[PDB]
């Protein structure tokens, strides 16, 4: 219904809160909880447990089965401070 806009500030300070996040596909996913599920047998991420959780997230986005649980890890959409604070002329 509403777009959760995560900033670079949120990304940094929430890591100190104990929730390590990352920015992929213009979205912010919870890697701390991701890797916990990856350590759990019979979980879709247990096959990606030998891979780095941030890279394994991309493989999980790519695969149609595993992208369904990515909806659970996606805290919100990432939007940069600079990105909405600039007027862009039609030249790109």
UniProtKB/Swiss-Prot annotation:
Known disease link: Intellectual developmental disorder, autosomal recessive 38: A disorder characterized by significantly below average general intellectual functioning associated with impairments in adaptive behavior and manifested during the developmental period. MRT38 is characterized by global developmental delay affecting motor, speech, adaptive, and social development. Patients manifest autistic features, aggression, self-injury, impulsivity, and distractibility.
Transmembrane segments: none
UniProt comment concerning the protein's domains: The ZZ-type zinc finger mediates binding to SUMO1, and at low level SUMO2. The RCC1 repeats are grouped into three seven-bladed beta-propeller regions.
Annotated function: E3 ubiquitin-protein ligase that regulates ubiquitin-dependent retention of repair proteins on damaged chromosomes. Recruited to sites of DNA damage in response to ionizing radiation (IR) and facilitates the assembly of UBE2N and RNF8 promoting DNA damage-induced formation of 'Lys-63'-linked ubiquitin chains. Acts as a mediator of binding specificity between UBE2N and RNF8. Involved in the maintenance of RNF168 levels. E3 ubiquitin-protein ligase that promotes the ubiquitination and proteasomal degradation of XPA which influences the circadian oscillation of DNA excision repair activity.
Name under which the protein is recorded: E3 ubiquitin-protein ligase HERC2
Domain of life: Eukaryota
Full-protein positions shown: 1205 to 1296 of 4834
The record's account of how the chain is modified after translation: Sumoylated with SUMO1 by PIAS4 in response to double-strand breaks (DSBs), promoting the interaction with RNF8.
Record's subunit section: Interacts with XPA. Interacts with NEURL4. Via its interaction with NEURL4, may indirectly interact with CCP110 and CEP97.
